Amino acid sequence: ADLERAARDVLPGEIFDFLAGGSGTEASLVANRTALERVFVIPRMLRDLTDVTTEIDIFGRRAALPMAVAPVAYQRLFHPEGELAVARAARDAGVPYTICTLSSVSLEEIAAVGGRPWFQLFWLRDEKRSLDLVRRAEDAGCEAIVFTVDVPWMGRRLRDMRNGFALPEWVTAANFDFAPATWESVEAVRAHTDLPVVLKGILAVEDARRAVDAGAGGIVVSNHGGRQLDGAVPGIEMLGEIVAAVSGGCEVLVDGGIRSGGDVLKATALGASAVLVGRPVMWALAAAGQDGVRQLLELLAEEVRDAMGLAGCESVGAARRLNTKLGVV
Amino acid sequence: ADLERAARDVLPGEIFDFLAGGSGTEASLVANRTALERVFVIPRMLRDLTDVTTEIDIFGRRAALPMAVAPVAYQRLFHPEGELAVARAARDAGVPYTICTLSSVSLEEIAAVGGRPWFQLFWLRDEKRSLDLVRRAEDAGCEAIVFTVDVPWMGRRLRDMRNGFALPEWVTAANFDFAPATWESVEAVRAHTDLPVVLKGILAVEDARRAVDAGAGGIVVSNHGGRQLDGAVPGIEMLGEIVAAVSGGCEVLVDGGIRSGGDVLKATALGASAVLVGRPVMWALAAAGQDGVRQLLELLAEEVRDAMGLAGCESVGAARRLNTKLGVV
Amino acid sequence: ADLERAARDVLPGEIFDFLAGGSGTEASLVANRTALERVFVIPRMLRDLTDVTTEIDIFGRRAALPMAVAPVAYQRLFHPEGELAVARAARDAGVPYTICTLSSVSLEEIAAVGGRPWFQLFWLRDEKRSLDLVRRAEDAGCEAIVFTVDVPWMGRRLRDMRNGFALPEWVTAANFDFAPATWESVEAVRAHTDLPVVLKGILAVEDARRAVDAGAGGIVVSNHGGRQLDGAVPGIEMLGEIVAAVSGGCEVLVDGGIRSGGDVLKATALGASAVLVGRPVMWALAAAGQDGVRQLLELLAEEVRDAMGLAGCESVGAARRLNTKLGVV
Amino acid sequence: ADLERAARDVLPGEIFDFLAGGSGTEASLVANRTALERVFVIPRMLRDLTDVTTEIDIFGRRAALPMAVAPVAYQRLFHPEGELAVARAARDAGVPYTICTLSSVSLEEIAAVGGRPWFQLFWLRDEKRSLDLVRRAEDAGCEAIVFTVDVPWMGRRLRDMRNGFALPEWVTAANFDFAPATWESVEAVRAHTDLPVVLKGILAVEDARRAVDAGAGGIVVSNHGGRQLDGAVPGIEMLGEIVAAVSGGCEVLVDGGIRSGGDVLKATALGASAVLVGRPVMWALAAAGQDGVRQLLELLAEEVRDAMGLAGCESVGAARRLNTKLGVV
C-alpha cells in the first residue's frame, strides 16, 4: 500500500522489473489479483469481540499474524541491509521469515537475528549439497524447510530477457562457496530432518493429497507469483478444493497477490492456515529498510485485526469458518 | 439523479468524500452498483393497472413508497437545516425517516417534525446510555429502533485518513451532553422497548434467521454502503437467500446503491419489503435543502410508479413476485 | 451497417435521439446487444446446400426472409416519403411491413402499396376506437394484428425530456381525426377479427403460454428496444425458454438489436420463427429513402443467406435446429 | 511474438489485412483469443522430467512438436520464396507443413522440399479435378489429405471489400492451369486414397462423431481463424467435448489463436493431439523469410518444452491428462 509507489521512484527500472515480473504474458501474475478481487466475504455480526486475536500456532510456534514473509532471493538488490533488515522486522512483528537458498546474506547470519526463521530449499544438481543446506538450516535453528517444488527450472521472464538483467557484482549467493525436485527428493529431505517440510508451489488437488501422504507438514498453494508457468491457475482458485482434500492433514498456506488484511481475511475464509507475502515486503525494504518493513507489518496487522472484527471473527479459526461468495469484477 | 453533480460543485471536497466514501479499496462500494446492474427484471404484461399503488404497510404504519431514508450522521455537514429539512420532506412524502444516533440536531426535535420517524441506535460503551437513548426515541414517538449491528467499530476510511477529515466545530452530536453490539445487546434493546427492532447490517443467512429467532421485527440486508468491511458481499447479492430463509418472519429491507425507481423495483423483485436510500438524499439536501429532498422523493415516487406499471405490478406485493434473471455487465 | 453513420450526419440531433433512445439509463438498450454478442452458433458442416432458401411461411403467407419491419412511429420524421417508401421496399424484398397506429401516413394508403402488411395496435382509452382501427386494418387487407402489449403507457425517455423533443408540425398521426391493454383487451381484439393476433412485448414465460391459451397466433419476445422498462431482461435472453414453453403453439418472433444476418441466424438458432428490425430500417430510410431501405434489405438478405450456408442450413427450419453456446464478451 | 510488429511495418496494409482479417464483425477472430486466455492449466509437480520430449506420432510419422503449419494460401503474398521457404523451415524443425490448394508454388515442388507434407483440399465444382488433386498430392509423397469442410464458399471479409483487395499479377494459383463439400465428397476422397483424411473446420460434436464414422483419420476443430461464419463458436470452446465424443477414434487437432507454447499446452490439456499455427508463420515469413520461420519454430519449440516441464509433463500424452480450470478474463 502506498509503498509500491515509493519503491518505483527509487529502484533501478530493471531491478523493479525483476521484482514485479511474471512469466510470459504475465497471465498468471494478473490472475492472482483478479482472483482475489472476485472473492467476497460474508461477514458475521453480533459476536463477542472482547478478545480479538490474530495469532495462530503453526509448525510448533505461535505467530502474531496468519502470515509469513515469502522467500525472495537477493534482498540486497533492494536495500543494503537486505535480508537482515527484513528478518529483524519480521522477528519484532512476531511473523515467520523465510530465508532463501539464494539469500544475499548467509542463512546462519539471518537465523542469528532470532525470531522464527524458515528456510526455503531449492534442489540442486547434487543431492548432497541440498541435504547439507537442509542440515545447515536446521543446525542454525530454522523451524521449517519450505521445499520449493515448482522450479524444476526457472520459468521464462520476458522482462529480464528484454532488460538483459543480471546480478550486479555487489550482490551474491552467500550460502554458496538447479535441478528438478521429485517426490524422491521430498522423501530424501523428509528423511534427513526432523523439521516440518512444507511444499511450496502445489496447485493440483492430487499433489496436495500426495504431499500429505508423503509426510509434508505443510503446503503452499501457489503459482509462484505468476513467475513459473504462464497460464497456471492462481493459487487462490485452488485453495478451497485443496483445503477440503487434505482434510486437516497438513497446514495449507497460500500466496500470490496478498495486498491487505482484507485479502488475508479472504484467504483465511477460503480455508488457508496462513498467507505468504512477497513483493510488498520488498517494496517496504526498498522504500525504507528495516523501519519500512516494520511499518508494512504494523499496517498489515491492523488491517487483519480490523477485517477480522468487522467480519465477526475473534480468532483466525473463526475467520476460516466464514463463507464466501464469488462476484463479478 | 443529476443531483450528485449539483452537490459536487457545492460541497467541500473533504465533506463530499466523507459522504461518497467506502472502506479500503472501496471494493464493496462499487460492488453494490455492479450487483444491481446485473439484475434484470422479467416484466409481466396485460394485467389490470387501474389502481397502481406504491404503498406498503410496515412496522404498523402505511408508507407512501417501499422506501425509507437511511440513517446518515451529521446532516448539518450538508446543509444548515440538516436533519430537520430531510425529516420534513420525508414526512410530506409519506416516507419513513431514520434519525441517527449521531444526528446534528436532537432526536426529540427531529421527531417533533412528525411523519414516521425511526431511530438508529449505536451501542455505546455504557449499556445504560444505549437503553436511555432507546427510551428517548420511544418517548418521542419513534416507530422502530434500527439497531446498527455492523459497527462493532468504524471501518477504515482511506479517503478520510488521507484527507485528515474532521468534524468542523459548528456540527455536533446533538443527542449527547462506541462499543460492539452482541446478541445480548439485541436482547437488552428488545426487552427495553415495545417498538419493533430492526437489525441493520445483516449479510449472513444464518444471522438473518437468528435475527428472527431473537425477536427482531426486521432486518436491513446491507454492507453499510461499502463503508464497513471492504470485501463484504453486497446486500443485494444476499437478499434473495435471506428472504427465503426468514420465511416472512420479519421484514427484510435492503440498501446500498439504490439510485432509481428501477432499482427499487429490482430490490422488491428480489424480495425486499423496502429499501433504504442514503447518499442520494444527502446530495439533494446539499443541492437545495428541504425542497431539494422533496423533489428527490417525488422523482423517486414517479420512477417507482412507472417501473411498477411497466412490469405489470399494481402493488408492491406483485412486484415481490416478479422473477429476475442475472445478466452480463 | 454503415448506414447509422450516414443517418447521424443528416438527422437533427433530437430526431436521431428519439430514434436511438432507450428508457432511463438505457440499461436494456445496451443489454439487447450485449446479449446477442454472447451467443455463439455451433455450425454444421458438409450438408447439401444445393437449394439454400431463406423463405418461411408465417401467418398464412410466404416471406422472403425470416424478418419483418418493426413498427416505428412517424416515419416522416426520418424522410419525406416516410412509411410509403419503407413499405414499397419491404414489399419488393418480400418482407412483411408493420404499419403503426401512429403512422405519419394513413394505414389504408400504406396497405395499398400491397406486399404483406401487418398492423400494430395500441389500445386506446376507447375500446371502440381500438376495435375500429382493427377493422380498418383488416378491411384494408392487413394480414396480422400486432397488438403491442408492453405499453400500458410510454416508458420514461431521458433523452427526450432533456431534449425537450416534440413532434414538429409537419408530422402527424394520420390514422386519427393511450390506455393499458389487458388480457380482456386481447380477447376483444381476438373476437373482432379473423386475422392472427400477435402479442408484442412478451418477456415472461408464463405470459407466453397464456398468449397461446388466449388464442394468439404469435408473440414477439421483446423489451421494446430498451424503450419501456429500463432493466427489463432482453428478449434474446428469454427466447429459448419461451420457445420451449409454447411448444409450437404460436409463432415466436424476437427483436432488439438485430444488426446483421448473423444476428438473424443467432435468433433463429435460439428458436425464433422470425425477427423484427426497427432502428436500422429507419437509418436506411433517412440515409436514402426507399432505395436506401431496398439496399438494407438486400444486404440483410445476402448476410442471412451467407450465414445460413456457412452454418450448414439449407432452410430456416434447419437453422432453428442449430445449437448455440454462450461465451464471454 | 514480436514478429507481428515486424510484419506490420513491412507488408502493404491491404496484404496485412488479408492476413489478419476475420469475417463480418470479426466476433469469432477475437473469440479465439478470448477463449484461450480464459483457460488455466493446473500444473503437476515433482515428477521426473529427466527426458522431456515434445514429440508425437501422428498419421504414421513422428513430429518434433504437437504442431503443424496451417494451410494459408498464396504465401508469395508475404515473401518471394513463399511456400518453399515455410516448407524448408518446417521440414528442418520436424513439423508438418500443410500445402494449400491455392499455393503460390506448385504442390509437387513444395513436397520435393521433403519433410512431412500434408495437402489441404478444397472441393471444386468438378469432382474429377478434386480427386486428381488428391492423386497428385499422394503421388508427390504427401502424408495426409486435410479436407477443408468449412468452406462451402468463402465467408464475407469486410476488410477485403472495403480495401478492394485483389491478387496482384505476380502471385498465382500454381496448382491450376469452388463448390460445397458434402459427406459424399468426403467419401469420394476417402475411396480415392489410402492417405489419412483429416477434416478441417469441425465444430459440432455430432459432426466430429460422424467424421469418425465416415473413416476420417483426423479432424481439425476450427472456426477457420474467424474467417468463415462470424459468430461461430471458437474451436477451443468445443475441443474438450469433441475429444470426449470421438473417444480416441481419430486424431483431434485444434487451431485458432495459438500464439505461444503455453497456448499449445492449453490446447493439449483440453485434449488436442496437436495444433495448427497459421498467421504467426506468415508474420515470420514476411519478417525474414525462411530463417524467420526457422526462428518462430525454435522459439515455439522452446516455449512448449518449457511449458510442459513447468506443468510436470515429460510427454505430450502427460500434457493431455492435465486438468484445466476456466477463469475470468
Ligand SMILES: Cc1cc2c(cc1C)N(C[C@H](O)[C@H](O)[C@H](O)COP(=O)(O)O)C1=NC(=O)NC(=O)[C@]1(O)N2
Ligand atoms: C523477485 C522475486 C523472487 C522470487 C520470488 C518472488 C519475487 C517477487 N518467489 C515467489 C515468492 O515466494 C511468492 O510465491 C510470491 O512472490 C508471492 O506472490 P506476491 O509477491 O504477489 O506476494 C520465490 N519463491 C521461491 O520459492 N524462491 C525464490 O527464490 C523466489 O523464486 N524468488
Ligand SMILES: Cc1cc2c(cc1C)N(C[C@H](O)[C@H](O)[C@H](O)COP(=O)(O)O)C1=NC(=O)NC(=O)[C@]1(O)N2
Ligand atoms: C456519510 C454517511 C454516513 C453514514 C452512512 C452512510 C453515509 C453515506 N451509513 C450507511 C447508511 O445507513 C446506508 O447503509 C448506506 O448509505 C446505503 O447505501 P447508499 O448511500 O448507496 O444508498 C450509516 N449507517 C448507519 O447505520 N449509521 C450511520 O451513522 C451511518 O454510518 N453513517
Ligand SMILES: Cc1cc2c(cc1C)N(C[C@H](O)[C@H](O)[C@H](O)COP(=O)(O)O)C1=NC(=O)NC(=O)[C@]1(O)N2
Ligand atoms: C423510434 C422508435 C419508435 C418506436 C419503436 C422503436 C423506435 C426505435 N418501437 C419498438 C420497435 O417495434 C422494436 O421493438 C424495436 O425497435 C426493435 O429493436 P431494434 O430497433 O434494436 O431493431 C415501437 N414498438 C411498437 O410496438 N410501437 C411503436 O410505435 C414503437 O413504440 N415506436
Ligand SMILES: Cc1cc2c(cc1C)N(C[C@H](O)[C@H](O)[C@H](O)COP(=O)(O)O)C1=NC(=O)NC(=O)[C@]1(O)N2
Ligand atoms: C490469410 C489466410 C488465408 C487462409 C487461412 C488463414 C489465413 C490467415 N486459413 C485458415 C487456417 O488454416 C487456420 O484455420 C487459421 O489461420 C488458424 O488460426 P490462426 O491464424 O489464428 O493460427 C485457411 N484454411 C484453409 O483450410 N484453407 C486456406 O486457404 C485458408 O483459407 N486460407
